[PDB]
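My main concern about presentation is that the manuscript never shows what a single data entry looks like. The format is easy to grasp once an entry is in front of the reader. For illustration, here is how one protein appears when written out as sequence plus structure tokens:
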Amino acid sequence: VAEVDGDQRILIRSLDYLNNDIFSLSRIKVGLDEFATIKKAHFSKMVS
């Protein structure tokens, strides 16, 4: 059991390449299979 400072899993430059085939504003991928999604707001509030 050693201890070291956790490395960075995601790089900003990285996901610019990963997202060129994914055109969606709530669905972005920050890794191989994990996604990032903005919470849904249930449309009924679209009148405002």
